[PDB]
Amino acid sequence: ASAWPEEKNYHQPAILNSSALRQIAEGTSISEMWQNDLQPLLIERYPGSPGSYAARQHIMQRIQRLQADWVLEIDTFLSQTPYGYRSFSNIISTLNPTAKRHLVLACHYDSKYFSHWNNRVFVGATDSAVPCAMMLELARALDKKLLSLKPDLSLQLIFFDGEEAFLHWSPQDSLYGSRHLAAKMASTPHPPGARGTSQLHGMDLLVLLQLIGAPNPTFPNFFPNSARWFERLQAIEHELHELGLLKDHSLEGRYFQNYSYGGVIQDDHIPFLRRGVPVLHLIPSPFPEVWHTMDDNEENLDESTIDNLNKILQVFVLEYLHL
Ligand SMILES: [Zn+2]
Structure with missing residues (x-):
């Protein structure tokens, strides 16, 4: 019985030095992201709408133009809603699909x-x-490094519908895509051919x-089983700051603050957390x-805040993947 699903408990990052950190800071463009990835998404896109369709096309197109070998899957299903049966479509973008372990970034x-x-x-x-x-800007900015993945660990992006x-909000009216995907991944053998491990065991x-x-x-540290990863975000933010790589930023007003949060916040991570998946929830408290x-x-x-967070996230990802 392989102990590979336990590898995540000991995985350590490969920390980038100053020179590498300036490279990441300089390689992401907040203005390019703003015009090419964000603006096309600023449209009404509730489930089943024409905007939902357009959003999904935009996301798949921006991923498909990249050099890295992304495999795109649209997970479509029906669910009961306060307005009757409806169709939903999660978008999953994966590098190295048969790779046993994946670092997963997600949003809805x-x-x-x-x-x-x-x-x-x-x-x-x-x-x-x-x-x-x-997420699109990250896929774009790290494209050359991610191409090299073409530790059986890779990257995956999920855009929940x-x-x-x-x-x-109500238990039954919300989190449609994630409650669906969580159950689906929990009952999907992984890697292909496996006897007793699922895609969820593969979520690092x-x-x-x-x-x-x-x-x-201000992002609090929500979970003890991901606390060490929260600390890495703190370390990264601090070092990018000291190297002068962030904009209009101060340590007093740092984003990742040393402090926890006992309450439960309903979000797409819930269905995964309740099945034992480790979660780093990047939602601020209080809300905007x-x-x-x-x-x-x-x-x-x-x-500038979005730009700063783009640099922090990209560094976190490259360090996690040893890229
Ligand atoms: Zn909302």
Whole structure:
């Protein structure tokens, strides 16, 4: 009986030096991300809408133009909703599908349904268009390094559909895509041909980004079994800061603060956490002031903060993968 699913417990990062850190900082472009990945997502995209379809096409297109060998899968299913049966489509983007272990980054690409109000449309800029754009920018910025993966560990990105409740949150009205994907991966043998391990045993760590893009975010350390990874984000932020690689940033107002949070926050990670998957939940506490209002738009996004977080995340990913 192989003990490979236990490898994640001991996996250590391969830390980048100063020179490598300046390279990562210089290799990501907040303006390119803004125009090529984010703006096309700032549209009404609740499940089943024409916008949902457009969002999904945009995401698959931006991934397909890259050199790395991404394998795209659309996981489509039906679920009961307050409005009756509906169709949903998760987008899964994987490097090295038969690779036993994967570091997983995720966000939801749907936008909460709201009828038009005084000609205003809800586009959920921080929730979660920016997290989506950040994942695409990461795939783009690290493309050359990720191409080299073509430790049986690789990378996977998941864009969940239907994270939002159609009405207000309830156990049955919310997290449609993730409750579905979690159960699916929990009952899918992995790697192919395996006798007793599933795709969930292969998830080294689930890094879920939500509500990112507002000013002064503060991310607490939610789980003891991922606490050492939270610490790495703290170390990275601190070193990028000391090297002068972040913009309009101070240690007093650092994003990753030494402090926990006992309460449960409902999000796409829940269905995975309840099946034993380690989670690093990158959601700030408190939530952006514009949370679930028509003001969660482009105008209220803090550009340098997103840029800083892009650098932190890309470094975290390269260190995890030893790239
Ligand atoms: Zn939301």
